[PDB]
């Protein structure tokens, strides 16, 4: 592994699209010393980087709601962790990763064993009304119903197997998404007070 769990403490923050991962992580970094890395943000930044050989590939995976190949994802991830660790940041909230078993096992074998997975358990009809409203507010390119159906599909098929894998290892803490932002945060806080 490039790191001992001493050096780098990683919590994976998982859940379907619109479950509130981005929202809870940005509140948490106000109260805790964790650095938040969003895998979809690292990807959208590479996609628009002048000189990227991956621009079209990332653009098309996001549009189609596909999992971008792990080699690309992992390298972006590894680099962002390395800059923080050099900048002397040892605790990370990795949001949106791993989304597929291969990413999951490569990360934990080559980089670092995670502390635990915070999983936002969320009903799909709730995720769907939050993404159509996010679509109106922010106008993110994949927050359109054709892409939303591909992202829900990929989530059930590819990403839920990973949840079930970490659950065998007793590393999953489920939090319900369907309460107000402030009531979901209280349970996020109780889960982290308990899990360190
Ligand atoms: N861990 C990952 N591995 C591969 N592709 C990813 C990963 N995370 C995000 N992506 C992608 O970029 C898109 C948007 O991700 P993200 O912004 O994290 O979305 P969401 O709001 O749906 O949680 C995903 O639908 C997929 O195409
Ligand atoms: N508990 C909540 N109740 C209502 N809207 C929420 C709640 N949590 C997050 N939202 C939002 O609904 C959308 C999805 O949340 P977001 O954090 O962006 O999710 P994710 O990162 O899982 O895709 C955003 O517009 C955000 O403002």
Curated annotation (Swiss-Prot):
Residues involved in a ribonucleoside 5'-phosphate binding: 44, 66-68, 96-99, 103, 140, 151
Region (LID): 133-143
Cofactor: Mg(2+)
Enzyme Commission (EC) number: 2.7.4.14
UniProt entry keywords in alphabetical sequence: ATP-binding, Cytoplasm, Kinase, Nucleotide-binding, Nucleus, Pyrimidine biosynthesis, Transferase
Recorded GO CC terms: cytoplasm; nucleus
Quaternary structure, from the entry: Monomer.
Name the UniProt record assigns to this protein: Uridylate kinase
Database matches in Pfam families: ADK
SUPFAM superfamilies named among the record's database cross-references: P-loop containing nucleoside triphosphate hydrolases
Biophysicochemical property: pH dependence: Optimum pH is 6-9.5.
Organism: Saccharomyces cerevisiae (strain ATCC 204508 / S288c) (Baker's yeast)
Function summary: Catalyzes the phosphorylation of pyrimidine nucleoside monophosphates at the expense of ATP. Plays an important role in de novo pyrimidine nucleotide biosynthesis. Has preference for UMP and dUMP as phosphate acceptors, but can also use CMP, dCMP, AMP, GMP, dGMP and dTMP. ATP and dATP are the best phosphate donors, but can also use GTP, dGTP, dCTP, and dTTP to some degree.
Any one Gene Ontology molecular-function term assigned to this protein's record: (d)CMP kinase activity
Matching PANTHER family: NUCLEOTIDE KINASE
More info: Present with 1500 molecules/cell in log phase SD medium.
Source domain of life: Eukaryota
Taxonomic path: Eukaryota, Fungi, Dikarya, Ascomycota, Saccharomycotina
């Amino acid at each position: 592994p490039a790191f001992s769990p001493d050096q780098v403490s990683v919590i994976f923050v998982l859940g379907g699209p619109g479950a509130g991962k981005g929202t809870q992580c940005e509140k948490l970094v106000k109260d805790y010393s964790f650095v938040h890395l969003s895998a979809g943000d690292l990807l959208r930044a590479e996609q628009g980087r002048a000189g990227s050989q991956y621009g079209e590939l990332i653009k098309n995976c996001i549009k189609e709601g596909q999992i971008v190949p792990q080699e690309i994802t992992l390298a972006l991830l590894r680099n962002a962790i390395s800059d923080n660790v050099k900048a002397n940041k040892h605790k990370f909230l990795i949001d949106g990763f791993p989304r597929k078993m291969d990413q999951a096992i490569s990360f934990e074998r080559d980089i670092v064993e995670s502390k635990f997975i915070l999983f936002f358990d969320c009903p799909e009809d709730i995720m769907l009304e939050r993404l159509l409203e996010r679509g109106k507010t922010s106008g993110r390119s994949d927050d359109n119903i054709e892409s939303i159906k591909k992202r829900f599909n990929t989530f059930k098929e590819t990403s839920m197997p990973v949840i079930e894998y970490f659950e065998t290892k007793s590393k999953v803490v489920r939090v319900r998404c369907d309460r107000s932002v402030e009531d979901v945060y209280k349970d996020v806080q109780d889960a982290i007070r308990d899990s360190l």
